[PDB]
Design a protein around this ligand. Structure first.
Ligand SMILES: [Cl-]
Ligand SMILES: [Zn+2]
Ligand SMILES: [Zn+2]
Ligand SMILES: [Zn+2]
Length: 63
């Protein structure tokens, strides 16, 4: 069911990069990683959830 989260936007709470990050998604805090591990999304940025792996949101640029 975490699969229904794909396509949602999320707000970065702790900087999201290769191997750490946290976002606010449907009112909850989720772990997150960047889709491209060279790209960091800083706190306050809005990202798009493009995949979920277990309970980790994989995020990219909004849209
Ligand atoms: Cl959304
Ligand atoms: Zn939702
Ligand atoms: Zn980049
Ligand atoms: Zn996948």
């Amino acid at each position: 069911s975490p699969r229904a989260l794909v396509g949602h936007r999320a707000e970065v709470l702790e900087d999201v990069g290769a191997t750490s990050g946290q976002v606010r998604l449907d009112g909850s805090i989720w772990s997150a990683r960047s889709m491209d591990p060279t790209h960091t999304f800083a706190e306050g940025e809005i990202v798009s959830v493009i995949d979920i792996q277990g309970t980790t949101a994989i995020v990219w640029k909004e849209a």
